[PDB]
């Protein structure tokens, strides 16, 4: 998270780290057994680390669970990154509580202007790699579909939304993919793509989770 603050303690209980030998993505816990994430984070045999504080030391809460089914969205386009959404089913159900807790799915999409919380363990530096040990948080508003489309001409689909600061300085970054974008206690978007990090006039792009609520719900009920 380029230009963020340490979340500290545990205020992002629904956060999870996708490991494949090392951390490579984040994800949100939708409920005991399922984890939503960026379809481009898909990898063969992912291991989910929940209730993490420091992704290197055993900070009390330590839960490494293997993923049973890693269901990628059936229309995700690896090129356009449209429909960048994937559901993960944990081999074993995660232990819900005050530590690890699920985040709620939205019922209606966030109107532009809404202030959200993006979080992750991705790179902090704009230029150069400085991957943090602790979870970083970033308050950021949802930009207008217009400023979004203008920044990334045509590339911005109906399943994408821009969030951050057009000025730059604060934005999600490599290692933050699949992470949560919570607005008013709901999961609104998944950290997806953008140009570099915190670059002026190049806001972070995120997956519009509200458009996938149905799919999410059906997938869980059948698998």
């Amino acid at each position: 998270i380029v230009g963020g603050y340490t979340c500290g303690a545990n205020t992002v209980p629904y956060q999870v780290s996708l490991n494949s030998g090392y951390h490579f993505c984040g994800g949100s816990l939708i409920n005991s057994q399922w984890v939503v994430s960026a379809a481009h984070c898909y990898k063969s045999g992912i291991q989910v680390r929940l209730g993490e504080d420091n992704i290197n030391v055993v900070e009390g809460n330590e839960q490494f669970i293997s993923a049973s089914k890693s269901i990628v969205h059936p229309s995700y386009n690896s090129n356009t990154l449209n429909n960048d959404i994937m559901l993960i089913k944990l081999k074993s159900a995660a232990s819900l509580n005050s530590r690890v807790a699920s985040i709620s799915l939205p019922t209606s999409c966030a109107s532009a202007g809404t202030q959200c919380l993006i979080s992750g363990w991705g790179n902090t530096k704009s230029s150069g790699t400085s991957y943090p040990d602790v979870l970083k948080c970033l308050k950021a508003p949802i930009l207008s579909d217009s400023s979004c489309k203008s920044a990334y001409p045509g590339q911005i689909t109906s399943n994408m939304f821009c969030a951050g600061y057009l000025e730059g300085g604060k934005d999600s970054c490599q290692g933050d993919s699949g992470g949560p974008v919570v607005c008013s206690g709901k999961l609104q978007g998944i950290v997806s793509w953008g140009s570099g990090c915190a670059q002026k006039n190049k806001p972070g792009v995120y997956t519009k989770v509200c458009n996938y609520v149905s799919w999410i719900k059906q997938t869980i009920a059948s698998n």
Binding site: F24, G122, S177
Partner: protein
């Protein structure tokens, strides 16, 4: 990759009217060894390199 003006964009190149350039466009994953680079020097949007460059 795309035919472009008098030239032809290969692998990781994006076509700019008449010239093929690289992009800083990337998904936000964490490649252990960074993004994979084509023979032209560009890095692919969201594909990681299998070994340090």
């Amino acid at each position: 990759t795309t035919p472009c003006g008098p030239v032809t964009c290969s692998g990781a190149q994006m076509c700019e009217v008449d010239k093929c350039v690289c992009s800083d466009l990337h998904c936000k994953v964490k490649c252990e060894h960074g993004f994979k680079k084509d023979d032209n020097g560009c890095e692919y949007a969201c594909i990681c390199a299998d070994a340090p460059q």
